Amino acid sequence: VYPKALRDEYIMSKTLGSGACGEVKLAFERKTCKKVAIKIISKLNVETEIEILKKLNHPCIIKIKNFFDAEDYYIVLELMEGGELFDKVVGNKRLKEATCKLYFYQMLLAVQYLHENGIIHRDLKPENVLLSSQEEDCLIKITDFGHSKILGETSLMRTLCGTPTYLAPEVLVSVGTAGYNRAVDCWSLGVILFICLSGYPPFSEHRTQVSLKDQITSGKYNFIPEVWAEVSEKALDLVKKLLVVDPKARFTTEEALRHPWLQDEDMKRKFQDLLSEENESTALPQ
Amino acid sequence: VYPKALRDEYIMSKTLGSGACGEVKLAFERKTCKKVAIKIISKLNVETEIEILKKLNHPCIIKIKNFFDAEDYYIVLELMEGGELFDKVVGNKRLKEATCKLYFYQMLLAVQYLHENGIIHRDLKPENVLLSSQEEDCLIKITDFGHSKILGETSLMRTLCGTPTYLAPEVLVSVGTAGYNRAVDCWSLGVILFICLSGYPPFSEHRTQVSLKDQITSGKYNFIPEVWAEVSEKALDLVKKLLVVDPKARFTTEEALRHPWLQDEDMKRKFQDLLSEENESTALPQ
Numbered sequence: 001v002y003p004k005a006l007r008d009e010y011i012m013s014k015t016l017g018s019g020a021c022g023e024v025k026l027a028f029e030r031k032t033c034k035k036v037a038i039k040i041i042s043k044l045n046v047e048t049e050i051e052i053l054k055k056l057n058h059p060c061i062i063k064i065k066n067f068f069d070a071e072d073y074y075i076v077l078e079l080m081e082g083g084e085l086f087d088k089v090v091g092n093k094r095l096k097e098a099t100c101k102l103y104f105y106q107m108l109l110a111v112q113y114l115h116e117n118g119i120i121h122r123d124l125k126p127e128n129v130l131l132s133s134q135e136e137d138c139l140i141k142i143t144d145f146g147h148s149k150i151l152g153e154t155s156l157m158r159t160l161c162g163t164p165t166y167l168a169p170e171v172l173v174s175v176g177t178a179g180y181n182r183a184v185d186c187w188s189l190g191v192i193l194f195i196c197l198s199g200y201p202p203f204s205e206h207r208t209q210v211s212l213k214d215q216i217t218s219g220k221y222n223f224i225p226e227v228w229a230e231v232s233e234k235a236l237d238l239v240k241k242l243l244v245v246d247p248k249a250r251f252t253t254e255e256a257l258r259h260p261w262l263q264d265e266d267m268k269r270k271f272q273d274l275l276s277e278e279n280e281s282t283a284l285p286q
Numbered sequence: 287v288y289p290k291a292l293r294d295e296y297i298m299s300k301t302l303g304s305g306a307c308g309e310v311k312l313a314f315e316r317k318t319c320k321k322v323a324i325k326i327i328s329k330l331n332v333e334t335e336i337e338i339l340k341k342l343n344h345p346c347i348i349k350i351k352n353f354f355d356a357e358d359y360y361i362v363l364e365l366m367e368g369g370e371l372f373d374k375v376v377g378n379k380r381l382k383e384a385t386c387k388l389y390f391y392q393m394l395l396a397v398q399y400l401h402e403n404g405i406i407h408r409d410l411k412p413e414n415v416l417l418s419s420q421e422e423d424c425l426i427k428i429t430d431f432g433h434s435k436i437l438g439e440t441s442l443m444r445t446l447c448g449t450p451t452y453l454a455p456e457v458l459v460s461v462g463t464a465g466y467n468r469a470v471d472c473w474s475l476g477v478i479l480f481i482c483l484s485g486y487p488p489f490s491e492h493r494t495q496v497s498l499k500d501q502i503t504s505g506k507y508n509f510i511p512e513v514w515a516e517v518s519e520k521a522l523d524l525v526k527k528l529l530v531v532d533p534k535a536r537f538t539t540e541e542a543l544r545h546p547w548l549q550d551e552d553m554k555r556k557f558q559d560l561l562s563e564e565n566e567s568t569a570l571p572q
């Protein structure tokens with residue numbers, strides 16, 4: 001059964017999604033009679049995922065409404081009635097280029113916000129992008145921070161304050177590449193954008209003898225001209241700057257937000273319109 | 287002043303050592319009237335250092351007798367009347383080869399024990415080796431676990447259980463070198479052994495134009511033949527196998543314990559004798 005404290009505040013309804021380690025249910029908040037989503041996770045832990053998310057405040061990142069630590073973990077959030085982006089790209093389906101741009105711009109803003117706040121997501125994929133409604137033109141939010149990591153003063157930074165009389169060479173060599181952990185999120189964004197634009201994955205074991213690992217480390221994505229002929233050259237140029245193998249040469253979220261593909265005032269106006277529509281503000285002086 | 291709960295159980299006496307972030311005092315336990323050492327650390331944290339050390343049980347690793355979490359941290363341990371190894375090697379002083387072997391064997395056993403138990407020290411140096419008495423032939427213990435790290439199931443291991451459709455190439459490349467963090471302790475041991483045998487540091491900025499960093503990453507230690515002529519070739523051979531730049535080719539503690547320099551039954555008998563002398567056993571059936 002559901003725990004008493006949850007049942008006290010919410011009436012539980014149908015499953016909206018399920019799968020590995022958890023489930024998402026529709027529920028109704030008793031006080032307001034409004035729909036919420038409840039994520040159930042079976043017993044980074046959930047507690048610290050919760051702590052990270054309570055500190056963040058961006059319209060394209062999920063917020064926690066409530067939390068119950070019982071036999072299982074129950075996390076209450078606002079219902080994203082559109083569900084997972086995954087369902088929009090599965091089975092070779094693809095989105096209009098304009099719709100990809102709208103969604104991708106929002107993902108970039110969300111991930112840029114994470115990286116400014118010292119957080120790396122590390123599991124960005126279409127399953128972890130939620131859509132606010134069933135219309136094509138909608139707001140998205142990034143979810144599932146179970147793999148996320150907090151950036152801070154590293155062991156390396158502390159080591160380098162002393163004299164390295166006794167320090168192993170590999171630690172000194174690691175100085176060249178440290179502090180670029182966030183670039184893993186930029187690579188994932190690149191893969192997501194590729195899937196959205198094209199309807200198919202850049203790296204997969206489908207009809208090839210090159211191992212998935214070799215495909216990825218060489219950066220040689222499967223390019224199928226006929227699928228891409230309908231997609232603009234600017235869109236593909238961005239994909240190529242995100243799927244760079246050298247993490248230091250890879251586009252950051254900032255570089256991506258300044259790329260010509262995203263200098264689209266129509267797209268931006270649509271986003272702003274969707275934001276104000278979503279929001280329920282108090283009165284304002286002047 | 288000292289906190290009430292400490293004063294309650296112990297009478298504090300003179301400073302034995304001091305310096306950066308802390309101090310070590312002589313104290314007397316009231317119940318037994320015997321000498322203890324009290325490490326004072328000003329406010330990994332100390333709490334978790336304490337937790338690590340309460341779980342370990344090896345004669346060449348310090349044990350915690352008591353702990354007080356007050357305005358400062360006060361940690362009670364058995365007094366090592368010989369003090370720090372540092373004082374035996376400072377000012378170009380060096381130890382007899384036989385004494386180095388005795389001490390180094392103990393360091394190897396201690397670090398081997400750490401690595402078997404999933405702990406890496408990361409700050410092995412002569413300041414962190416304590417001597418049990420003022421005689422040359424004595425037991426040593428490794429101390430200061432403030433930089434230590436616990437090995438366990440990594441982020442990498444969890445990532446590799448899924449399909450890397452969205453996984454960045456640098457994570458896959460890091461698979462080649464992961465899981466060799468412990469080799470940093472072996473490098474430090476090598477530096478300590480070099481200092482003990484020779485009276486001088488292998489890498490330093492003294493009378494050279496090669497930066498300390500370049501000296502270390504190239505593995506080019508300062509070899510001064512006249513200082514080393516008195517030292518055996520077996521001793522130096524071990525140093526060379528520990529100061530290997532490739533962490534995967536570097537000698538592990540096990541390889542080092544099987545090296546011909548450490549196949550010395552006299553040394554081993556001396557160690558065993560010092561152990562039994564230290565120990566205060568209960569009666570035994572047969």
Ligand SMILES: CCC/C(=N\NC(=N)N)c1ccc(NC(=O)c2cc3cc(OC)ccc3[nH]2)cc1
Binds near residue numbers: 017022
């Ligand atoms: C703070 C917990 C964040 C989290 N997962 N965290 C985790 N697995 N560690 C998580 C993961 C997924 C979701 N999913 C949803 O909210 C969701 C809403 C929804 C609506 C649908 O139809 C209208 C269909 C699927 C849906 N998933 C919500 C939260």
Ligand SMILES: CCC/C(=N\NC(=N)N)c1ccc(NC(=O)c2cc3cc(OC)ccc3[nH]2)cc1
Binds near residue numbers: 325336339416
């Ligand atoms: C659990 C705390 C371990 C620790 N330091 N930890 C830390 N700095 N984070 C630590 C560091 C150093 C010592 N030092 C000693 O016990 C010590 C004994 C002693 C005796 C001396 O003369 C007879 C002279 C110096 C001495 N240091 C003891 C504990």
